[PDB]
Structure formats: structure tokens, C-alpha cells
Amino acid sequence: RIKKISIEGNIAAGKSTFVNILKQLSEDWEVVPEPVARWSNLTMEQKNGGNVLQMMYEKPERWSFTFQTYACLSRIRAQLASLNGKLKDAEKPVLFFERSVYSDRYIFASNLYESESMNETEWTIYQDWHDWMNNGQSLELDGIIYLQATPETCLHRIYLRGRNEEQGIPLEYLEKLHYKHESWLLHRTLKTNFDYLQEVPILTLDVNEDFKDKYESLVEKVKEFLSTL
Amino acid sequence: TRIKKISIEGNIAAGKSTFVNILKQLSEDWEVVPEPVARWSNVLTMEQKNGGNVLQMMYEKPERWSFTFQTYACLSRIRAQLASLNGKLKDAEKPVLFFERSVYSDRYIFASNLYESESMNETEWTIYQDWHDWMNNQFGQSLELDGIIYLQATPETCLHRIYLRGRNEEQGIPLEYLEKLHYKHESWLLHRTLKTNFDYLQEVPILTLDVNEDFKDKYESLVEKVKEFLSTL
Ligand SMILES: COc1ccc(-c2nc(CSc3nc(N)cc(N)n3)c(C)s2)cc1OCCF
Ligand SMILES: COc1ccc(-c2nc(CSc3nc(N)cc(N)n3)c(C)s2)cc1OCCF
Ligand SMILES: COc1ccc(-c2nc(CSc3nc(N)cc(N)n3)c(C)s2)cc1OCCF
Ligand SMILES: COc1ccc(-c2nc(CSc3nc(N)cc(N)n3)c(C)s2)cc1OCCF
Ligand SMILES: O=c1ccn([C@@H]2O[C@H](COP(=O)(O)OP(=O)(O)O)[C@@H](O)[C@H]2O)c(=O)[nH]1
Ligand SMILES: O=c1ccn([C@@H]2O[C@H](COP(=O)(O)OP(=O)(O)O)[C@@H](O)[C@H]2O)c(=O)[nH]1
């Protein structure tokens, strides 16, 4: 009975921030972090995650396939966990996901292939591994929230977070990611392998303005979104 | 399930394919699941296409391709093993599904030997193990074995059998590598020293057949042991 809502957005758009605000607004609202976020910070996954992250930074064209498969698994099992042992005693439970299996593939893994960091064989193996691994069924989303921010807004926010590894993210890379989110979540010109996705409710939220201490209007839009469902 | 699931294990060219095509024929209650990679070796579905490619890339550059190939081959197995388990033997009196090797073969024979050969690094191998644990648990519950049939031959006989099997892409296979795979088969199925992370495997009944002698024309005794073995499961 738990509603599934994905929080989607570019690097630095404000997802963790938005999700961390949402968790604290209700005992019926819970939050599944992106494992790449937990990696971007020992469990076996955390060691594995860290090593593959740096490996991928150092040579994306060697390690993209490995990164992507482990990113996605780590995400499916973290979502399935939270779904299985959370919120059973909520009247209105909603699980918010920081990104989804659909970002993993149609944004990130697609972008890496489009940049030849995966060859055709790695990409095809990846989509097949995804089309099947996701059959993970109980993960169909009830809605998607798009946190929209210009490619430029993101780059400055990369400055505000200020992690050393992020300062060399090219505005060029954000921009490609941005067109992917827009075509998927705004234009809706993306034809995926998951029937329901062409018709799932999307809520588009302009986060170009700082919302850390001025989030009421955004949370209000989410509450209304949730009512429609 | 009501289906009896039995994996046939053994070294390369031990004669598993031979024996499996013999068993499928003998009883309407018997079905086989042939190995994905064994399929790829010859010669076009999506899987076959990826299959042929990653197998060729594997052979050229194993330090680069061992992780990717191992993931695909085990995914491909789990898929096909499900397909038979939910498809065939639906009206059979005493159903038997013979798996040509198992998810355990993937992990404890081939993936393992590649980590040991330095064809997968530590991170590759622990990510692989992580997934294998999880992939078989989320997806591979109904795949659990009722028994294993170990076709046990020596590397020399197997080497002998590759040279005779006239497959040029395989004429390169060296002996010490066959020794390495044999050694891991002995440790898993004969002595049962090899630890797996699969508790129930410790206790699965195991029939070992010495298959050094040729059996193509003359396999009746082997089958009688199988049928004897089956009657205890
Ligand atoms: C120097 O070249 C690169 C170096 C690093 C990267 C990285 N991309 C990402 C995002 S990929 C990704 N996939 C996911 N499935 C999830 C998620 N949060 N992020 C990193 C974490 S590191 C990407 C790079 O270029 C990719 C070529 F387009
Ligand atoms: C097109 O070239 C690039 C494309 C993407 C990237 C990315 N780098 C990163 C940083 S990897 C990282 N490692 C960490 N250990 C921590 C952390 N926050 N981020 C992304 C998330 S995306 C970096 C790229 O170039 C890096 C060289 F400046
Ligand atoms: C470390 O040296 C080797 C280790 C293993 C092998 C193997 N080659 C093969 C043949 S791979 C293959 N590819 C195909 N595309 C078709 C087919 N029937 N077989 C194995 C099954 S194992 C071959 C090796 O040497 C080849 C290069 F000297
Ligand atoms: C040139 O060096 C090599 C060439 C080929 C190989 C191969 N090993 C194998 C066995 S991997 C495997 N994994 C499975 N899960 C199943 C199965 N039947 N085979 C091939 C099919 S090709 C291995 C090689 O060396 C590996 C490091 F010694
Ligand atoms: O309303 C906001 C949203 C984000 N940020 C900052 O922008 C950077 C990226 O935020 P976050 O980690 O939430 O982005 P994500 O990668 O999670 O989308 C961080 O320094 C935040 O503190 C901010 O100052 N105000
Ligand atoms: O007792 C046997 C079993 C098999 N073979 C032959 O040796 C090759 C290897 O056997 P198989 O393909 O069954 O080996 P697998 O790799 O499946 O274990 C085949 O061409 C068989 O014709 C043989 O000569 N004697």
C-alpha cells in the first residue's frame, strides 16, 4: 500500500537536501538515499562502492559497466529493503526515492554509452541485465518529482557543496545530463521499456532559487501532488 | 517444486554435453537446461549476439572482460533455468530437470579461478560475489539443487578430448589451466573441503561418475547409477 515517488534531478539540483527536509515533516514519510550518494562520502558495499567510484573517475571507459551494474543492484536492494520493513504502521505511507532504476539507465548509463565509455556489447548486456533484474517488480512508481535546475545552477551548487572531486565536472557534462532529464521528465519524448512510464504523474519543481530555509511552497506542491494519487 | 533439479558438473570436455543429450532422450519425465556459454561457443538472438562477443573479448583480454562475462553468463543461466522450471514437465509423473552446470559452477569454478589468475581484481570479485549472493536470492530460489552428478575425468583425458573435439578456438587451451579447474572440482564435489556461502550445498547428495572410459556407444551402466541416485532424492 506504500506509494512510491522518485525524486529526480541533475547533479547538485538539491535532491538530498529536498529528501532530507521531507523525511522530517512526517512519521509517515520515509526516504531511500541514492547509494552513489553514500559512496560519494566499513560495509562490503561501502568499500566496493568507493573503489569503483574512484576507478570510474580515473578511467570511465574501463569501469562504467561495472559501476552502473553495481550502482543499480545496490539501489534495487536498498529500495526493496525499505519497502519490506518500513512504514507498515502508517495510514498514509509514502516512500521517496533519491533517484531510481530509471535514472540509473536512461540518464546515467545511457550517457556513458553515448560518450563511448561503454561499447555496444556492454550497453546491450547492461540493458538486458536491467530489463530482467527489473522483473524488482514491486518497484513501480506511483509518481515522479522532478527537481529542475539550470545546468548553470547546478555548477555553482557543486561549488557550494565544495567537494574536491566535483570541481572538474564540466558544465558540458551537466548540460548533457540536463537535456536527458528534460526530454524524459519535461518534454516526455523518451520511449522506455516500462509501459507505465509514459503516463506516470510527474511534478516539476523549479529549485533554481535556494529553498533550504524557504521550502513551504515546494512542500505544499508535493502534498497536493500526493492527493491526486 | 515437484520437479527434481540435478546439475551435471565436471571439467571442460569431460563429456557433460554428450551425457546430457543421452539423458534427455531416455525419459519423457526428463528435461535438460544446456549451458549458456556452451551455446555461445558455436554459432542470432540478443543473448547469442552479446554472448558471442563477450566470449571473444574474454578470450583476447581476460583481465578486462572476466567480470562482464561472468555476470552475463550467470544471469543467462539463471534466466534459462527459470524458463525450463516454469515451462516444461508440467504434466510429468516424476519430473527431472538436468542443469548443464549450475550458478555454483559459475562462482566456485570459473569466476573463482579467474580472480585467482588475476583476471578479476579484488573489487571485481567482491562485487561479483555480492551480486551472486543477491541475484540467486531475489531470483534463484526455485533453482536450488536436489543433487549433483560429478562427471570426474582427468585433465589429460579432457585435453585428449579437446584435441579430438576438433574445435579450433579451443585448440589453445593449456593443461595446467585444466589441472586448475579439475583441482577446484575435486575440492568442491569429492572431498567437500571448499567452502561455499550456500549452507544447503554442504548437504546436497552427490553422485560421482568416473568418465575416463568412452561412453558414447556404451552408457547403460552410467544411467543405471543415475536412476539409482535419483531414487534416493
Ligand atoms: C572523466 O570522465 C568521467 C569521470 C567521472 C564520471 C562520473 N559520473 C558519475 C555519475 S554516473 C551515475 N550513475 C548512476 N547509476 C547513478 C549515479 N548517481 N551516477 C560519477 C559518480 S563519476 C563520468 C565521466 O565521464 C563520463 C563520460 F560521459
Ligand atoms: C566530461 O568529464 C567529466 C564528466 C563527469 C565528471 C564527474 N565527476 C564527478 C565527481 S566523482 C566523485 N568522487 C568522489 N570520491 C566524491 C564525489 N563527490 N564525487 C561526478 C559526480 S560526474 C567528471 C568529468 O571530468 C573530470 C575531470 F575534470
Ligand atoms: C591462459 O591460457 C588460456 C586459458 C584458457 C583458455 C581457454 N580457451 C577456451 C576456448 S574459448 C571459445 N571461444 C569461442 N568463441 C568458441 C569456443 N568454442 N570456445 C576455453 C573454453 S578456456 C585458453 C588459453 O590460451 C589461449 C591463448 F593462448
Ligand atoms: C588467453 O587467456 C584466456 C583465454 C580464454 C579464457 C577463457 N576461460 C573460459 C572459461 S569461463 C566460463 N565461465 C562460466 N561461468 C561458464 C563456462 N562454461 N566458462 C572461457 C569460456 S574462455 C581464459 C583465459 O585466461 C584466463 C586467465 F588465465
Ligand atoms: O535549496 C538549496 C538546495 C541546495 N543547496 C546546496 O547545493 C548543493 C547541492 O545540494 P544537494 O547535495 O542537495 O544536491 P543533490 O546532488 O543531492 O541534488 C549543496 O551544497 C547544498 O547545500 C542550497 O544551498 N540550497
Ligand atoms: O566419453 C566421451 C564423452 C565425450 N566425448 C567427445 O569429446 C568431446 C567433448 O565432450 P563434451 O562436448 O560432451 O564435453 P563437455 O564440454 O560438454 O563436458 C565431444 O566432441 C564428444 O564427442 C568422448 O570422446 N568420449
Swiss-Prot record, chain A:
Supply the EC number(s): 2.7.1.74, 2.7.1.76, 2.7.1.113
Q: Which residues form the active site?
A: E98 (proton acceptor)
Question: Phosphoserine is carried by which residues?
Answer: E45
Documented effect of changing D104A: Strongly increased catalytic efficiency towards deoxycytidine. Strongly increased catalytic efficiency towards deoxythymidine
Q: Which Gene3D superfamilies match?
A: P-loop containing nucleotide triphosphate hydrolases (3.40.50.300)
The record's principal subcellular location, in a coarse class, is nucleus
Q: Tell me the protein family, please.
A: Belongs to the DCK/DGK family.
Q: Report the protein name in the record.
A: Deoxycytidine kinase
Q: Which gene encodes it?
A: DCK
